[PDB]
Design a protein around this nucleic acid. Structure first.
Lengths: 149, 77, 46, 271, 217
RNA sequence: AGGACCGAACCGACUAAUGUUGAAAAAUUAGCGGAUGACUUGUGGCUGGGGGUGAAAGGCCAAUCAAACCGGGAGAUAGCU
RNA sequence: GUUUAUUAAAAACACAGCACUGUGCAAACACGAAAGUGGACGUAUACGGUGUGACGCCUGCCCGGUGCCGGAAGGUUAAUAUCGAAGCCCCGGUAAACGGCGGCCGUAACUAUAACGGUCCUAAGGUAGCGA
RNA sequence: CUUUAAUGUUUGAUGUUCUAACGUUGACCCGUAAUCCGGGUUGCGGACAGUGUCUGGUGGGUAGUUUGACUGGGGCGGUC
């Protein structure tokens, strides 16, 4: 169908780009995910007025989502923000494994290719130490301090 | 079944046909598939069996408008 | 050699029992048919 | 093992049999036992569907599973036992768990043998593990293909498969066939095999044997009246005609493959 | 003709008949193939291994038998076929119909050529047998054996009588045997005695023909 | 021990004979085969007609079966008696 | 052994054994428009199909390597009207090829048949079964 | 115009990877001290597969019927 995006920026289409799209991408990815809202010559008018608010006020702690996204598409340097990516560097214990929650791409992951650790990892500040496996049953490690602002 | 629940479907009467123009009959199934629609207005999926003309139709009018009906068509939501 | 006539009340009745004949629309289309044709045996299993 | 019948009759002139004295003779463990069922093989609407199946003897099923579980504190082999529920021999184990269970039961057994279903494994012949911790080139039986679904390939006498490679995720094994197929990365199959590599020489021998084996005559189509089923033949038993089955086209030296979903695991076809 | 000897190209489209045009329907072409019959003493049947022996085609071979001219069987564009050939069975179904001749199967391509010599050769051999110098004597002598062995048919409690055969021409070999009446033999026994001759003196050539005349009864 | 031998029951029917408007819609009479297993049998139950089923004869499927039985189409249709 | 109940018991049908093929499980396949079900609570020493018919005894011929055979299109060998077709690779086809399964010559003692080689073909080579 | 580029393109193929439809006869939780099912979680597959339409090839398995007439019996033959 067609939508006006709600998305700040998206790899094609950005920042209240009203465009038509594939039906199979649009209804099951651009919506329902908040990255678009349907377009109609009714909707566009509503939306045009709305987006001076919505694609600004919502879209301002969302800068994080585009950045952190790389880190979870690879799962080499598994990095998400729990509160961060919009507050400076990714810091505190907060982030991935301290609640054992990190977003996956499709449940096929390299972020639980072994489990072994006694209280997880992360415990520095102003940077955040992830464990970056070197095997699948030994945890000799190569820990990094990546951020994804 | 084999019905859209919207557009209104069921297989409907046919025949093989030949330039011979022989006599036999066969019906004809529409293109329906049960597709997992996202209600959003209770933010769940209420997977309905739907046509593929209809799939379009649902889209153009929007989720809770097909789902406005069903209730108004007196039938399983 | 045996004969076509074999015995049993039991088997006879649960070849067609009244209720079983009251319990499938088609052989009940019949039940009614005959009934309207006015035969006071019906089942033939009284 | 092998024992040859001494002829005192024809009807005992070609009965080749194999005795099973290394199992107890008498009842087995009923609280792990369950009924059989017979229906002449016949369909949901009972029909002759796949001919010849049915009869036999009576036999009995035995409540079983090969998912190698209650892993905990190991078991030991108590006895082996015949059952007509496989062309093999099955066996009771007693756990230290205080569990009691039967296992499919490999060749190497001699009772009191140590069993552990523990994933660390003592790499003991006949013992199971998921293939992602196997040795290279290992011989394994009880090939599944979804992880922990429970073996369904290779659970017969002397059936095994050689592991060919385990590379990345997924393990390719050679099915007894000369078939290379990749099952999943975790997936089980039990080290080695169960033997009974001699019941190959066991025979029916006669119709009486086949009767207690439920083989109801594979009735020769080919010399029937072609009217109700066709293939070849006639009243004159004549040849020089176009040979096809009722589907109108040959079934003998024709491929088949109605599983466009398992090509993807198949690397080199069966024979 | 090349090498004096005549070759024909025939049927209607797919043949790679894309010519000056002359067969508005499916019919005219057939008028040509019947010309192809007239002119032969040898016909070659191209069949494919991947569209050959079609219904029309098997009829086409049946027709060939009428055509009364030598059959040599060619399979062309056969270097691209699959390593387990489909095709032994395809040869077997035609074999059983069955065409006593000499076959000789050819597996060529017009886009490679393999069979090229073997085709040239096969036709000559087939022509010699077909065109064979014949002669009342040979025919009578082999015939006696046959009738003694398996019995001339009897009709209405009266036994028949054969008593010589001669050759009515040789090129497609025809014989006319003077015995008992036309209906006193079934076509089958005619053929039996014919098949016998086809057997006892080589005929890698064409089907041979037998006739019966009456005068004695 | 055994598709073991002989042979009653019980089932099956090879010869003959008889009946053939019977005594009997296939028996009787008289010999005869198998008989602990490819056995036999009861009771009940289930496979349904362009269909089963079928140790296969184009058998058998309610005395009927190279197409059940029954109802309707249907006062069929029949250049034929 | 089984069988044409109500003409026909057999040489028919069956049958072990054997042979061949197809099928990797959500199996092939089979029924059932499908759902489902059977196949199978099984699992390629099986399962399904098909086919042959105990048993014993009559020898059942692998194309890949490399070679061979016919053929052309090429390669390779030629003149150097270059193109290079004939013989050979190759393409197809080829194991009565090396190598296990014939003769003929010498040789396991009436020479002759011959395990080895030669000779027909880059055939093992009457060993099996069976002898005037 | 034939022809040919350079450039603008327009579009379809293959190649690869993904996940989000879709599949999941994996495993578990749950209605429900239910091998059915449903929902949810997770594992695995994956834009496939399969199916709907349309559409080419095949198809005696299934289906309706077609296969003259003359005739010193017919069929045979020969003939119209």
């Amino acid at each position: 169908m067609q939508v006006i995006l709600l998305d700040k920026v998206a790899n094609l289409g950005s920042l209240g780009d009203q465009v038509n799209v594939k039906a199979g991408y649009a209804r099951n990815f651009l919506v329902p995910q908040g990255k678009a809202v349907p377009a109609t010559k009714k909707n566009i008018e509503f939306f045009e007025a709305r987006r001076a608010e919505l694609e600004a006020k919502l879209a301002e702690v969302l800068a994080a989502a585009n950045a952190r996204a790389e880190k979870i598409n690879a799962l080499e340097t598994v990095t998400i923000a729990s509160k961060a990516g919009d507050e400076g560097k990714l810091f505190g214990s907060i982030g991935t494994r301290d609640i054992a929650d990190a977003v996956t791409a499709a449940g096929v992951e390299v972020a639980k290719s072994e489990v072994r650790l006694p209280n997880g990892v992360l415990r520095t500040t102003g940077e955040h130490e992830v464990s970056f496996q070197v095997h699948s049953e030994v945890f000799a490690k190569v820990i990094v301090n990546v951020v994804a602002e | 079944s084999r019905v859209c629940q919207v557009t209104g479907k069921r297989p409907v009467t046919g025949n093989n046909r030949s330039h011979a123009l022989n006599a036999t009959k066969r019906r004809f199934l529409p293109n329906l598939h049960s597709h997992r629609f996202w209600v959003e207005s209770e933010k769940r999926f209420v997977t309905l069996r739907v046509s593929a003309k209809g799939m379009r139709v649902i889209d153009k009018k929007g989720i809770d408008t097909v789902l406005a009906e069903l209730r108004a068509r007196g039938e399983k939501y | 050699m045996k004969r076509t006539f074999q015995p049993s009340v039991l088997k006879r009745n649960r070849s067609h029992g009244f209720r079983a004949r009251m319990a499938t629309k088609n052989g009940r289309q019949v039940l009614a048919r005959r009934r309207a044709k006015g035969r006071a045996r019906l089942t033939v299993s009284k | 093992a092998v024992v040859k019948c001494k002829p005192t009759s024809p009807g005992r002139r070609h009965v080749v049999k194999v005795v099973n004295p290394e199992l107890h003779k008498g009842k087995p463990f009923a609280p792990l036992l369950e009924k059989n069922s017979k229906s002449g093989g016949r369909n949901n609407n009972g029909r002759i569907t796949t001919r010849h199946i049915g009869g036999g003897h009576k036999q009995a099923y035995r409540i079983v599973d090969f998912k190698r579980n209650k892993d905990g504190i190991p078991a030991v082999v108590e006895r082996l036992e015949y059952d007509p529920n496989r062309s093999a021999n099955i066996a009771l184990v007693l756990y230290k768990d205080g569990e009691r269970r039967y296992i499919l039961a490999p060749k190497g057994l001699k009772a009191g043998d140590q069993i552990q279903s523990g994933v660390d494994a003592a790499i003991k012949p006949g013992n199971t593990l998921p293939m992602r911790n196997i040795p290279v080139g290992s011989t394994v039986h009880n090939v599944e293909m979804k992880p922990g679904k429970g073996g369904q390939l290779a659970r017969s006498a002397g059936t095994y498969v050689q592991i060919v490679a385990r590379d990345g995720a997924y393990v390719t094994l050679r099915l007894r066939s000369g078939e290379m197929r990749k099952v999943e990365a975790d997936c089980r199959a039990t080290l080695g095999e169960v033997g009974n590599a001699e019941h190959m020489l066991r025979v029916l021998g006669k119709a009486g044997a086949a009767r207690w084996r439920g083989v109801r005559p594979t009735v020769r189509g080919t010399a029937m009246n072609p009217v109700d089923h066709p293939h070849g033949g006639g009243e004159g038993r004549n040849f020089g005609k176009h040979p096809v089955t009722p589907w109108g086209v040959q079934t003998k030296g024709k491929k088949t493959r109605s599983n466009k979903r398992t090509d993807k695991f198949i690397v080199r076809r069966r024979s | 003709e090349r090498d004096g000897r005549e070759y024909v190209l025939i049927d209607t489209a797919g043949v790679r008949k894309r010519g000056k045009i002359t067969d508005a329907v499916e019919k005219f072409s057939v008028i040509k193939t019947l010309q192809a019959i007239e002119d032969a003493n040898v016909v070659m049947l191209v069949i494919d291994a991947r569209e050959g022996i079609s219904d029309q085609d098997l009829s086409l071979l049946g027709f060939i038998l009428n055509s009364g001219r030598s059959l040599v069987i060619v399979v062309n564009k056969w270097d691209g076929l699959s390593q387990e050939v489909k095709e032994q069975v395809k040869e077997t179904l035609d074999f059983r119909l069955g065409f006593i001749d000499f076959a000789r199967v050819h597996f060529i391509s017009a886009l490679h050529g393999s069979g090229v010599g073997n085709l040239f050769e096969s036709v000559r051999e087939a022509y010699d047998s077909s065109t064979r110098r014949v002669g009342t004597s040979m025919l009578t002598r082999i015939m006696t054996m046959a009738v003694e062995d398996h019995q001339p048919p009897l009709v209405r409690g009266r036994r028949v009588k054969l008593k010589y055969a001669h050759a009515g021409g040789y090129n497609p070999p025809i014989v006319v045997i003077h015995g008992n009446q036309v209906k006193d033999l079934p076509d089958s026994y005619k053929r039996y005695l014919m098949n016998y001759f086809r057997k006892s003196l080589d005929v890698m050539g064409s089907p041979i023909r037998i006739q019966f005349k009456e005068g004695e009864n």
